[PDB]
């Protein structure tokens, strides 16, 4: 049907507010070329960091 | 930061007077004064803020809680002296028989 | 200054803003909308917004030194 | 700079009065603090104010604490104590009421820093406020016994209740 | 005290005044700082129970 | 309602014994204000404040030791088993209470009573 994964990374954001939001402001930062070297990985990781922290303890019981 | 610098003398003034509280436990006569010493602090309190407000209800409390002032330090020394009668002297120790 | 009497013998400073900030309130069922009147009084009570705005002025200055 | 000569002051006297073995001392180190407040009045331009906390503060008030603690002749021993041991707990409690209330006003009462610029240009004078200018003394008296006449009066009767109490308490008549 | 003792101790307090209003021109000087961890810790809750009525 | 955190167990154990040290300082400072000065000491002001500091050492030390067990042992329960209830953390509190208050009260009895103590203070949160 629908991945239980896919749901529970949507219904875990609310936990993951202050990394989403440095995430999103980095991405405005660097909307300017600069030459294509700037970039947002280190925001990125954080907030799917704090994301799987939270979806992992929850999702092998929607598992069989 | 005239504000600042005359409400931090009327605060350093009641904080003297909780520490004479704080530091008299032998000495009732000085915990009375330093009772005085923060009722004093808050007159002033208020007239500092009557100023910096352009308002007058801070002079009039000012000159109410003076009436008060007065009040309450003439009948807590008479209320001294009976006890000081009573008992010949003013040691803390004389003035403990009320507890549990 | 919500009570009018000024310490020289004139209307209070802030006693305008305080009479339109209650007149609002008298009869705007939200308190929110009011907000404005509201700290343009407290505003006028301790400047803390243009001393603010002075101070990053000041700050600007001693940056560009 | 005045004001932190002022405070200076009001602070060792204060100091003084808490802490001075003799009763008669702190006393007389109180009438110290009174007068720098005047002082402290006087420069917010409150003369009426600056001359009753010498009238009744040092000149009343005072006078009672003196001449009750003069005539009780303290003896050093019966409130004698070692004030070494409450350092700490006047460390703790010190630090947490100046930290809370040094800077209660800060929030909401921002300093306005001195500039290298010239800003007493930007006094803007208002000259019909001062064509019949108002002492404390009127500004006051104008209010006290007309909108708010109610509290002149309870404060009578608090100062009555001071008299009767006074006599009731400590008369015994030869 | 001896005199000199009040003395030495009024030097000491105006000393005291004159760090204090250092201290005062710091905190002063960090009101942009304050408003701007403010703006963040407010909006994040805002972002935040947002999200948590989209479901 | 919990959403404001960043945890780490050994961060939480070194937080909380250092919490459970301010408390205890806090706590040993009025004891020893609120006690008065043996007859010996009145008229001597330093040993009053040795013994003052040394209250507020021991009891800075106990409280530490307790604010550390107990988180320590509600994390150690709840890594190893895995599983998020009141259930976890009643045995932290237990071994707290029951350790430290008895080595301190010296009796068994004692432990026992001031584990079951903590064990319901942590059960009702």
Known sequence: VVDPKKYLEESCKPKCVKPLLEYQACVKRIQGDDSGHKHCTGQYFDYWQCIDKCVAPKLFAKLK | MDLIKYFTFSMIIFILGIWGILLNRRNILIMLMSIELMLLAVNLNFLVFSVSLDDMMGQVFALLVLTVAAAESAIGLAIFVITFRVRGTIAVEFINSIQG | ?65 | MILSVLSSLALVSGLMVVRAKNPVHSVLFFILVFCDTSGLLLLLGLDFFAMIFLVVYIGAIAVLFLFVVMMFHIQIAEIHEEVLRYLPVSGIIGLIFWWEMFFILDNESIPLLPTQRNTTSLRYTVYAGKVRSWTNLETLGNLLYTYYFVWFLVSSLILLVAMIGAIVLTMHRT | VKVLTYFGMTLAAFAFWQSMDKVHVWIALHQDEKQERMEKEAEVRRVRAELLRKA | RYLEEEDGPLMKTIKGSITGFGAGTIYGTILATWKDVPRVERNVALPGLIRTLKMMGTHGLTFAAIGGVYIGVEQLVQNFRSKRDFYNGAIGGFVAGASVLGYRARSIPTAIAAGATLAVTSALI
């Open chain 3, 1 to 65: 200054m919500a009570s009018g009497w000024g310490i020289t013998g004139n209307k209070g400073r802030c006693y305008d803003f305080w009479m339109d900030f209650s007149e609002c309130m008298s009869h705007c069922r939200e308190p929110k909308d009011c907000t404005l009147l509201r700290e343009d009084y407290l505003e006028c009570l301790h400047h803390s917004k243009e001393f603010q705005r002075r101070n990053r002025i000041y700050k600007e200055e001693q940056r560009k030194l």
